[PDB]
């Protein structure tokens, strides 16, 4: 994800699924290489104490002036026409300057944004369309016309560009937490399981205090936890042995 030679374009942003693996968010977050590392429903310090249901990394390049648009609820041509985060986004936005990775003395032009769209796009959608955009009241047909535009525009990343007009690589990590059977975790080692005694338990990052008993409840395969009428957990499925 973070060291791949070439990123996807912000108009056609890539998405990788992260599953069946141990994350170490300390190795990421304690790095000096990141200019932005902002989380939206968790603190980056706590990512090591959690297990995650599904995780996706979204990878793309933008201009340093535009990294401000990747926060949820923002607006402007990036947040309106090619990459929107949802208002209730949970995850982390991670970004760094690419002026030795994505930038060329003759101009690098491999990266494009979307300048025009009949509507603003919905959260986590992507538009691949190369349709000509009718900015005027007239329709048009064929490849070009007056007030008809190609909808994409290329960034001109040159190392002579000032900071803000330089490229920035962005990764967005876009997980969900403590609600469903988990598949990606921090590096925490399990203990043995003990029953009929009062203990400080932690199941997939669900920390609590109580006594554990073998339940006669019949969970379905998609259920990791059971809740009380007070919306507190009152049963769990052990992630080591599925009782």
């Amino acid at each position, epitope marked *: 994800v973070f*060291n*791949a*030679t*070439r*990123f996807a374009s912000v108009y056609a942003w890539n998405r990788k699924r992260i599953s069946n693996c141990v994350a170490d968010y300390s190795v990421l977050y304690n790095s000096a290489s990141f200019s932005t590392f902002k989380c939206y429903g968790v603190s980056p310090t706590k990512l090591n104490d959690l297990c995650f249901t599904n995780v996706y990394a979204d990878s793309f*390049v933008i201009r340093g002036d535009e990294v401000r648009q990747i926060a949820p609820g923002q607006t402007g041509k990036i947040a309106d026409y090619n990459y929107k985060l949802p208002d209730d986004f949970t995850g982390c936005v991670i970004a760094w300057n690419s002026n*030795n*990775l*994505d930038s*060329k*003395v*003759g101009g*690098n032009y*491999n*990266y494009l944004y979307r300048l025009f769209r009949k509507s603003n796009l919905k959260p986590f959608e992507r538009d691949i369309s190369t349709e000509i955009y009718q900015a005027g009241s007239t329709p048009c047909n064929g490849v070009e016309g007056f007030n008809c535009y190609f909808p994409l525009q290329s960034y001109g990343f040159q190392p002579t560009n000032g900071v803000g007009y330089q490229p920035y690589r962005v990764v967005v990590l876009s997980f969900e937490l403590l609600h469903a059977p988990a598949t990606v975790c921090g590096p925490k080692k399990s203990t043995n399981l003990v029953k009929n005694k009062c203990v400080n338990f932690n199941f997939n990052g669900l920390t609590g205090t109580g006594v554990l008993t073998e339940s006669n409840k019949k969970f379905l395969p998609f259920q990791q936890f059971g809740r009380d009428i007070a919306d507190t957990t009152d049963a769990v499925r052990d992630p080591q042995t599925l009782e």
Partner: antibody, heavy 124, light 107 residues
Framework: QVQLVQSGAEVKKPGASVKVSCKASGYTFTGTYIHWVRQAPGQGLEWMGWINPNSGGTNFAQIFQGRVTLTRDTSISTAYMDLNRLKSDDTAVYYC?????????????????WGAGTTVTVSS | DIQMTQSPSSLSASVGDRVTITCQASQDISDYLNWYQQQPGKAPKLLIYDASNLETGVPSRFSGSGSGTDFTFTISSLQPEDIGTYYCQQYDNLPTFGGGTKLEIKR
């Protein structure tokens, strides 16, 4: 572990055509470009062109434009060169090589893994 | 087009000696240049990328330097496994190759 496997050696008449394949394995085929490159007997290296397996788009070294065609099937993770109207001097060792998965630039070609290669021999 | 020419066509070098090879461009490449080793009977292998970054697992003896139109590659102490032809290739406009430098053991 990753591998590129070429077909066995090819022998052809002048003016004929040859199709050579690289079967990829051990990595995701659409991640990076495949180049084709050759070497004449006891001589230096000579680039043909590249293909982007995610898109099928391809770019050539000038001299080979309108002579070589590059193609690929994504299900079978195989990149091909099909070369038209073979000159006697197209007698060479041929290779394909991958476009650097990590630590490069966005542009830069490199050649980060190469297959064992194959010989094309041209004679009347 | 951009030409790449290597000044030494071949070199005779003893075990433990320092070896230097030069790649000369026709045009200012900044640092858009890579270096390869080809051993007899095998495909080439990438040694230095970006004119001065060493690739993973490569022996520390291999080195590269310079910027602009002109570049060096270096072996700080040659040993018998290093024997083969060394090539530059650029990337400012198409991957054009240089002519290559052969290495032989001095005797």
């Amino acid at each position: 572990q990753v591998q590129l496997v070429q077909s066995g050696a090819e022998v052809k008449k002048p003016g004929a055509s040859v199709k050579v394949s690289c079967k990829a394995s051990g990595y995701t085929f659409t991640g990076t470009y495949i180049h084709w490159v050759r070497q004449a007997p006891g001589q230096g290296l000579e680039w043909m062109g590249w293909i982007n397996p995610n898109s099928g788009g391809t770019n050539f070294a000038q001299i080979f434009q309108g002579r070589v065609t590059l193609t690929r099937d994504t299900s079978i993770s195989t990149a091909y060169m099909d070369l038209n109207r073979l000159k006697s001097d197209d007698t060479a060792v041929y290779y394909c090589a991958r476009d650097r998965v990590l630590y490069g630039r966005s542009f830069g070609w490199y050649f980060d893994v190469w297959g064992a290669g194959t010989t094309v021999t041209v004679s009347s | 087009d951009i030409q790449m020419t290597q000044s030494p066509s071949s070199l005779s070098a003893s075990v433990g000696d320092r070896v230097t090879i030069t790649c000369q461009a026709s045009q200012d490449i900044s640092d858009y240049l890579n270096w390869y080793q080809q051993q007899p009977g095998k495909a080439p292998k990438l040694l230095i990328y970006d004119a001065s970054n060493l690739e993973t697992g490569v022996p520390s003896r291999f080195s590269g330097s310079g910027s602009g139109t002109d570049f060096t590659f270096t072996i700080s102490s040659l040993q018998p496994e290093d024997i083969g032809t060394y090539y530059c290739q650029q990337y400012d406009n198409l991957p054009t190759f240089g002519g290559g430098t052969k290495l032989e053991i001095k005797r």
